[PDB]
Amino acid sequence: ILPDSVDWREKGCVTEVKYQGSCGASWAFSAVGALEAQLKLKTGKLVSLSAQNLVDCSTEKYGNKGCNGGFMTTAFQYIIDNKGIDSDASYPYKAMDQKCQYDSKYRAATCSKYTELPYGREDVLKEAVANKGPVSVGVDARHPSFFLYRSGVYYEPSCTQNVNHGVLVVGYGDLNGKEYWLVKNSWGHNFGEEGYIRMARNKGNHCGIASFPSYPEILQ
Ligand SMILES: CCCn1nc(-c2ccc(C(F)(F)F)c(SCCN3CCCCC3)c2)c2c1CCN(C(=O)CC1CCN(CC3CCCCC3)CC1)C2
């Protein structure tokens, strides 16, 4: 019933790969990346949203700690509560904790709601990627093989289901006998496959990719 593969980048719903640097803001990149796709779907415009806005403004009230880590779910809740998030162009990324400088004059998106998917359910994750759009997830990236990944379907025997790095599932497929998740990272274009990593799919929640999925929506 579900398509064999989906790629939301091919549907024009994914912005350029970003570079987080030495600031632990992968949660903020994962969240804006999911919302960017919903924004494209609803308005026809593809616009990078401000991860720095989340770093500086979605802070202790949201359980988040800026460059020391955060949640995608509470990032979405900030955008709901704030009734907007600035464009990345107006509020660019500095890889530092800064004062909140959100300005509604440069609001580029809103968020109406978000959804959390059940733990470890790669079938439900697949359905959501097919039927909803890119999904924010955490993965276990504390392995040299992850940092050193260049191409192919990533499979790390010592991976755990305990996540520590936010990323964005923008698709999935089946290539060269291997089912995979298509994952947008925030380590710049020189990481992996032009900034992407394809991660083993249907291998018992490999690297925790389906541990904590969430996605936002923008309602009419
Ligand atoms: C043991 C596992 C714990 N765990 N770990 C994650 C999780 C998910 C994704 C990543 C990613 F790598 F992608 F970044 C990470 S990396 C660690 C992030 N970590 C760093 C230190 C500062 C707090 C951030 C962790 C999640 C959960 C539980 C459910 N999850 C949620 O999002 C839902 C919860 C969000 C937090 N509320 C609590 C309150 C929220 C507002 C008021 C203050 C607390 C409860 C529901 C996802």
Helix (H) or strand (E) holding 35: helix 26-43
Beta strand 135-139 with 153-154: parallel, antiparallel or unpaired? unpaired
**CA torsion, ordered 179, 146, 70, 72, to nearest 10 deg:** -20
Contacts of 24 (CB under 8 A, 6+ apart): 67, 68, 69
User: Is CATH 3.40.50.300 the classification given to domain 1-220?
Assistant: no
Cα–Cα distances in angstroms (integers) from residue 53 to residues 25, 69, 88, in the given order? 11, 14, 8
3-class state of residue 157 by DSSP: coil
Helix and strand tally (H, E) in the chain?
5, 10
- Contact yes or no for 60/100 (Cβ under 8 A): no
Q: How many CB atoms lie within 10 A of CB 24?
A: 19
For ligand 1, say whether the CB of 20 is within 6 Å of any of its atoms.
no
- Contact yes or no for 178/130 (Cβ under 8 A): no
8-state DSSP, 163: -
- Contact yes or no for 108/77 (Cβ under 8 A): no
Which residue puts its alpha carbon closest to atom 17 of ligand 1? 164
Closest ligand 1 atom to the C-alpha of 70?
24
The Cα–Cα gap between 88 and 56 comes to: 13
The Cα–Cα gap between 182 and 38 comes to: 18
8-state DSSP, 17: P
- Contact yes or no for 63/70 (Cβ under 8 A): yes
- Domain residue extents for the chain: 1-220
Where are the extended beta strands (E) located within the chain? Answer: 6-7, 85-86, 107-109, 113-116, 135-139, 153-154, 165-175, 178-184, 196-200, 214-217
8-state DSSP, 23: S
Report how far Cα 101 is from the mean position of its chain's Cα atoms. Answer: 23
Query: Among all chains, which residue has been given the structure tokens 């291998």?
Result: 203
Contacts of 106 (CB under 8 A, 6+ apart): 86, 87, 89, 90, 91
Which residue puts its alpha carbon closest to atom 10 of ligand 1? 138
**What are the structure tokens assigned to 57, written together?**
């403004």
For ligand 1, say whether the CB of 33 is within 6 Å of any of its atoms.
no
**What are the structure tokens assigned to 163, written together?**
């996540």
8-state DSSP, 200: E
Query: Among all chains, which residue has been given the structure tokens 């579900």?
Result: 2
For ligand 1, say whether the CB of 76 is within 6 Å of any of its atoms.
no
Experimental method reported for this structure? X-ray
The Cα–Cα gap between 193 and 165 comes to: 18
Query: Among all chains, which residue has been given the structure tokens 């996540």?
Result: 163
